[PDB]
Amino acid sequence: AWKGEVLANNEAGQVTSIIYNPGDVITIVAAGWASYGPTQKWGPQGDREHPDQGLICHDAFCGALVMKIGNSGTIPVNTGLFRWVAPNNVQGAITLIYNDVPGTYGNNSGSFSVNIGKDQS
Amino acid sequence: AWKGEVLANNEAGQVTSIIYNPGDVITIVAAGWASYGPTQKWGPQGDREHPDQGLICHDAFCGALVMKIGNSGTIPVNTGLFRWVAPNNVQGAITLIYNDVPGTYGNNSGSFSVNIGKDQS
Ligand SMILES: [Ca+2]
Ligand SMILES: [Ca+2]
Description:
By secondary structure, chain A is mostly beta strands. Chain A has no helices and 8 strands.
């Protein structure tokens, strides 16, 4: 299991100790407050009122928590995943990333606290 | 395990099928959008900018997801709990509740989708 902070301004993302392997079932819970620029802050689902202006994940709002597994594209995490299994052929290290537009992470702030565990399978 | 919706206007709370027993470890993941009255909506952590005007749970923001276990007082849930154990002497059915001021639930809208499972222990 892994617990750590994911900084909103960390464009490369936060690498975890979790290596997702075929057949694995995992659970993620994410909490906290972060911003993609404004003085306001949002939770791990991001800002539902803000337009997508080139986000690294088009399937979640700006400011949402997303992830990559090995060399996958971005996958929405939001507040978390419950006893979740990955798509076929998706495997490898889990990296957590704040959803923002490439090159615009410098004015971000805050972070999410995240737990990941592997479940019975 | 249990999956269901918790309506923001449900003042009595949503009873789940989970009976928390001594020693149990549980995980909860909550997602979605709801409001305590304004046109805007907030996620399961509620509205960090809104003052507490008599919330059923003073340890969470207005519009946050909270719970009671048996005859316990309210306990924050927010986006979820990861492999969590209850305080001593807390046991019974888990009821999930939107955090608002008593008697002011009538103008609430939206809901959270919540999963609860018991973990290995
Ligand atoms: Ca930004
Ligand atoms: Ca209300």
